[PDB]
Design a protein around this nucleic acid. Structure first.
Ligand SMILES: [Mg+2]
Ligand SMILES: [Mg+2]
Ligand SMILES: [Mg+2]
Ligand SMILES: [Mg+2]
Ligand SMILES: [Mg+2]
Ligand SMILES: [Mg+2]
Ligand SMILES: [Mg+2]
Ligand SMILES: [Mg+2]
Ligand SMILES: [Mg+2]
Ligand SMILES: [Mg+2]
Ligand SMILES: [Mg+2]
Ligand SMILES: [Mg+2]
Ligand SMILES: [Mg+2]
Ligand SMILES: [Mg+2]
Ligand SMILES: [Mg+2]
Ligand SMILES: [Mg+2]
Ligand SMILES: [Mg+2]
Ligand SMILES: [Mg+2]
Ligand SMILES: [Mg+2]
Ligand SMILES: [Mg+2]
Ligand SMILES: [Mg+2]
Ligand SMILES: [Mg+2]
Ligand SMILES: [Mg+2]
Ligand SMILES: [Mg+2]
Ligand SMILES: [Mg+2]
Ligand SMILES: [Mg+2]
Ligand SMILES: [Mg+2]
Ligand SMILES: [Mg+2]
Ligand SMILES: [Mg+2]
Ligand SMILES: [Mg+2]
Ligand SMILES: [Mg+2]
Ligand SMILES: [Mg+2]
Ligand SMILES: [Mg+2]
Ligand SMILES: [Mg+2]
Ligand SMILES: [Mg+2]
Ligand SMILES: [Mg+2]
Ligand SMILES: [Mg+2]
Ligand SMILES: [Mg+2]
Ligand SMILES: [Mg+2]
Ligand SMILES: [Zn+2]
Lengths: 60, 122, 89, 50
RNA sequence: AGCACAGUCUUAACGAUGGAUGUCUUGGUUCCUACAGCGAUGAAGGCCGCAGCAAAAUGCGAUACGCAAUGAAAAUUGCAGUGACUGAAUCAUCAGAAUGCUGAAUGUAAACUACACCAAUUCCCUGGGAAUAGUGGUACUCCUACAGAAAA
RNA sequence: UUGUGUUGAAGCGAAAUACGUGAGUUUUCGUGGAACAUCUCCCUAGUGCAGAUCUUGGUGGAAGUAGCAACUAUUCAAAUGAGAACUUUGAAGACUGAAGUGGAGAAGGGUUUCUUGUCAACUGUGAUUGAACAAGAGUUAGCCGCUCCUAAGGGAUAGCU
RNA sequence: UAAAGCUAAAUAUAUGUAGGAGACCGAUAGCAAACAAGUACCGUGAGGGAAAGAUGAAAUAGUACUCAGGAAUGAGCAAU
RNA sequence: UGAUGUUAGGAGGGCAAAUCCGCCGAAUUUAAGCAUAUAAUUAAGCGGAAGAAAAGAAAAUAACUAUGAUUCC
């Protein structure tokens, strides 16, 4: 769970890096949901919101 | 209203506004009365009811019992007290819903938010 | 005879006169004239007449999403300068 | 028939998707009354009209 | 243990079927007051999508039942989950960012996810690196300026 | 203006040693569960139903009646099941007779396809069956097609009205 | 003092949006629509177009237990 | 002088109509029949704008001891 005000000081380089690893993690969760491993199905929402926040900061 | 023509006294309108109030308005409607002792220490007459307060039940079948507030239900307009309970037909235990205006709260639970309100009210 | 003017000739009714219309989605596009019977698609205008009050109110401005218009309300009372934000903190 | 266009096949799939019952967990909700879906369609009775 | 013929019709008492009557109302209707357009910087309408479990209506757009910011301010809850112990759980406001394919629809077409020509295109660090067949432009009529050619 | 009501309103059912020529008014018991009058005098109207092949809704006698008739035809034994003339297996007797209830396509339909489960309604008699109901699956192309060419024709550009 | 031109106010508003009110209607009434209503459904098409409100103060009281029955369902010395 | 120009900068196109501006244009009906008349310079059709639009500063009345752009009651 990341915050917008803690990202205003990062450079574009590591902002893009952080987005990339967030996307890798969300793909892992989706794959594990396709298999009937329901344990971590509730974490998807937080990762989605984190991706949205990172994109907001980068675009501004 | 009484004299200003810019707000309504229609039963239809402000009876519709009570049952669809947004969740931020529902806590001002859910207010209780302060005891006599708390009315000298504080200059206010009534406060919105919060969780860890202590209340005396003054009206209803459970009038006269005291205890602590354990939950607030903003959708149903009701509060719940710590040892006022019920049995269902199964035998499971539940809490009896109390309406906050049927109550007078006798001990508060103060914090950063409360102080900056009671200070203004006094 | 056997495919007479009633039941017998209802069995010859395959084929289609109309299909779905691009620009309004109703099944009113004449496949052989190439022209919508409801909106008048191939032409720039909309094909609505004044002798049908009921038809004129099934597809008017209020009856859709109003995607861009609805965001444009209350700028008449806020009247903020474009490019502005509330003060921080 | 067996021959189709892309848009028509997508619409057929969409129409099939919407012909399913109301979920069971949704009925255990409060502030709800929806028992069954009032727009159900059987293939032999009511035609899609495409 | 025993005694009333059967059918048809009339009256009472208790029931079945049906939804009238009375009471209720987050709806209608009329009048009075005030403000008033939107669009090539892509409108109104159409289609396709988005939730952990999700059909409709409601809300949103690849950041998709919601992001940032500002005002309040502890919980939301069907399970599972997330929350200070106040840019965080929820409500309101809404000025920043973002806004699929279409549609006047405007490269050529259209019961096609069909086919062109022109410029390869985008990103990171401060001249170096990296990625991607991906991105943009090209309707018609008209006005001002300009360019040369051609006619007199 | 001046009154009734959780110590029971309106409404409804059955009634009355009751009043009135009459339209009606008044009261008892039962049910019911929340409001109801004013006759002191006035104002006001979408104000009084047996009918209109009247409108909308509900219900009868006919009546356990008409009827459940094309397509040659069924029988024995077993399994399953709460329950088998019309589910499955084996044995008989028969039909379609290549111009076939045999195979493969178009128009039209849109998941009816497959596996599993399974009976509230439907399958005009039964039904354990099913194209019904529920959960999950299944459609793979350089060589089969579209996509390309032109036809009878359609829409357009210049111009003209 | 024709054959050229511009110009506020006093006037209108069966549309859109917001606000207030009535000797108005009360679910066969009032807008077609008090409810997932221009919806379900009908027509090749232009078009046509409904029905459907009320448990209880509280389900954070929506019917536990026993007996009979294959089951539905019924009964109770049992229950809100 | 005309054509030409993916030359630089720009404009028009569609939606909505209760009130507003221009064109086009009936019959039902009444006359106890009916053809001029009426319905009506109306309904339907086609174009164009604004918070209002249109009109508007005398080639105007009057005939008086004279008034004085437009609009509306
Ligand atoms: Mg004929
Ligand atoms: Mg044809
Ligand atoms: Mg086909
Ligand atoms: Mg059929
Ligand atoms: Mg007898
Ligand atoms: Mg801060
Ligand atoms: Mg805040
Ligand atoms: Mg766009
Ligand atoms: Mg094009
Ligand atoms: Mg083709
Ligand atoms: Mg009365
Ligand atoms: Mg009458
Ligand atoms: Mg009557
Ligand atoms: Mg009658
Ligand atoms: Mg009959
Ligand atoms: Mg018989
Ligand atoms: Mg049979
Ligand atoms: Mg033979
Ligand atoms: Mg033979
Ligand atoms: Mg033969
Ligand atoms: Mg099958
Ligand atoms: Mg099966
Ligand atoms: Mg049967
Ligand atoms: Mg099915
Ligand atoms: Mg293929
Ligand atoms: Mg081939
Ligand atoms: Mg030809
Ligand atoms: Mg002049
Ligand atoms: Mg009103
Ligand atoms: Mg009605
Ligand atoms: Mg144009
Ligand atoms: Mg125009
Ligand atoms: Mg005449
Ligand atoms: Mg006559
Ligand atoms: Mg005549
Ligand atoms: Mg007209
Ligand atoms: Mg305008
Ligand atoms: Mg003007
Ligand atoms: Mg003028
Ligand atoms: Zn169309």
């Amino acid at each position: 769970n990341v915050k917008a005000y803690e990202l205003r000081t990062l450079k574009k380089k590591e902002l893009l890096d952080k987005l990339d690893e967030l996307k890798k993690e969300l793909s892992g969760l989706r794959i594990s949901k396709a298999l009937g491993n329901s344990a971590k199905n509730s974490k998807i929402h937080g990762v989605r919101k984190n991706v949205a926040r990172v994109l907001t900061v980068y675009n501004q | 209203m009484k004299f200003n023509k810019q707000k309504s006294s229609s039963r239809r309108k402000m009876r519709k506004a009570h049952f669809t109030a947004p969740a931020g308005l529902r806590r001002k409607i859910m207010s209780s009365k302060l005891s006599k002792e708390l009315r000298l220490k504080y200059k206010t007459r009534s406060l919105p009811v919060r969780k860890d307060d202590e209340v005396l039940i003054c009206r209803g079948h459970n009038h006269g019992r005291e205890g602590k507030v354990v939950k607030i239900n903003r959708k149903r307009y009701k509060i719940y007290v710590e040892r006022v309970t019920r049995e269902k037909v199964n035998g499971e235990s539940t809490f009896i819903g109390i309406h906050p205006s049927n109550v007078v709260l006798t001990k508060l639970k103060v914090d950063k938010n409360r102080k900056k309100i009671l200070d203004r009210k006094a | 005879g056997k495919a007479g003017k009633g039941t017998g000739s209802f069995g010859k009714r395959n084929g289609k006169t109309h299909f779905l219309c691009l620009r309004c989605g109703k099944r009113s596009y004449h496949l052989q004239k190439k022209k919508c019977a409801s909106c008048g698609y191939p032409s720039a205008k909309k094909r609505r007449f004044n002798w049908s009050v009921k038809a004129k109110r099934r597809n008017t401005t209020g009856t859709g999403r109003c995607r861009y218009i609805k965001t444009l309300r209350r700028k008449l009372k806020n009247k903020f300068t474009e490019g502005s934000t509330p003060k921080p903190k | 028939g067996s021959i189709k266009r892309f848009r028509l096949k997508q619409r057929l799939g969409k129409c099939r998707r919407q012909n399913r019952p109301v979920p069971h967990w949704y009925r255990l909700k409060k502030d709800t009354k929806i028992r069954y879906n009032t727009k159900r369609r059987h293939w032999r009775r009511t035609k899609l009209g495409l």
